[PDB]
């Protein structure tokens, strides 16, 4: 057979935009240490207070998302100029990260110890408001739990399954966050939305960037557990209202 004619026939084959974009979404890409190094090195090489920049990139990721070029078209010139600055120095991208790629989501994840304190102040300004989560759970949902990056500080190996309880309590927020950012999931069931995120969210909890003792101190400072490792009432009630949605 003639193989030049075989490859030539690909000119007359479907390059469907819908199917092509579907294949690239599934073959998707994590990396905590290298994100911290790249932000500090590129920030200081441009002579910036990269510490202050990390805070700004975190707050920008919590209120507008992971599409820097898209949010800049719906923002004041005051904010849009700061966005263009941080995109230049840190070479930010729109998602689907690589080995050395920096995204607004990966900054909030690697620098989660500050995200968990900014959640105390931004609960009413998030895509899913803190009062809404206060309505989904029968109590005041822990503000420390209102972003996926919280899973990076969850030690599943904590005694008496509290690490799995915190995870279950965290999942009650995760399902409603995924429904808002993916409109196709708004008609799915609670367990169908759960199966969509429990794989990368799990890899974060099983991550070893932080030790068991770091995550332990982290949860103590923000009020999820105490020095005696006693869960706050808002955690266990949100977890059992999550297990009810999945069970």
């Amino acid at each position: 057979e003639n193989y030049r004619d075989i490859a030539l026939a690909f000119l007359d084959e479907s390059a469907d935009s819908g199917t092509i974009n579907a294949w690239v979404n599934e073959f998707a890409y994590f990396d905590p240490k290298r994100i911290v190094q790249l932000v500090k090195e590129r920030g200081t090489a441009k002579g910036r207070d990269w510490k202050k920049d990390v805070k700004m990139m975190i707050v920008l990721n919590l209120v507008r998302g992971n599409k820097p070029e898209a949010m800049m078209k719906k923002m004041s010139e005051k904010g849009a100029s700061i966005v263009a600055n941080l995109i230049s120095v840190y070479q930010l991208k729109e998602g689907n990260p690589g080995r050395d790629t920096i995204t607004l989501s990966r900054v909030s994840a690697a620098f989660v110890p500050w995200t968990v304190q900014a959640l105390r102040v931004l609960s009413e300004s998030l895509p899913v408001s803190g009062t809404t989560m206060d309505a989904i759970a029968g109590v005041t949902y822990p503000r420390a739990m209102m972003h996926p990056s919280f899973a990076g500080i969850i030690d599943l190996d904590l005694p008496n399954g509290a690490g799995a309880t915190i995870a279950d309590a965290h999942g009650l927020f995760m399902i409603e966050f995924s429904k808002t950012i993916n409109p196709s999931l708004r008609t799915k069931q609670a367990n169908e939305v759960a199966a969509t995120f429990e794989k990368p969210n799990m890899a974060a909890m099983s991550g070893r960037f932080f030790t068991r003792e770091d995550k332990k101190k982290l949860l103590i400072a923000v009020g999820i557990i105490d020095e005696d490792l006693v869960l706050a009432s808002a955690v266990v009630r949100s977890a059992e209202k999550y297990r009810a949605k999945v069970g």
Partner: nanobody, 119 residues
Amino acid sequence: MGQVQLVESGGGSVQAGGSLRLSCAASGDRYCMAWFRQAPGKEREGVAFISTANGRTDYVDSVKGRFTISQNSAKNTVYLQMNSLKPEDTAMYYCASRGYGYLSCSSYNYWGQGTQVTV
């Protein structure tokens, strides 16, 4: 040598309409415990499971009501009470403890050697 080791017991030959109790001793570790069975020639299928906190328990549709899964948190053992056995229940029964908290019905991790029942 494994972090988790499972040993099932209680399998035997029982006439149709009888009942036997399977027990599984755990060693090394909080998890959702599931009983699976595989008849000769057929594929291994799920029978029962219970949640980590013991609040939720679920059985496959073929054996629902007839089978009863339970656990003694003190002795760290899982039981499978099987009543009204049928010839189709003839299979080797295994125990599992996959994943962790979030879902409830994982599929296919630590396994035991299994035990055979014949009806």
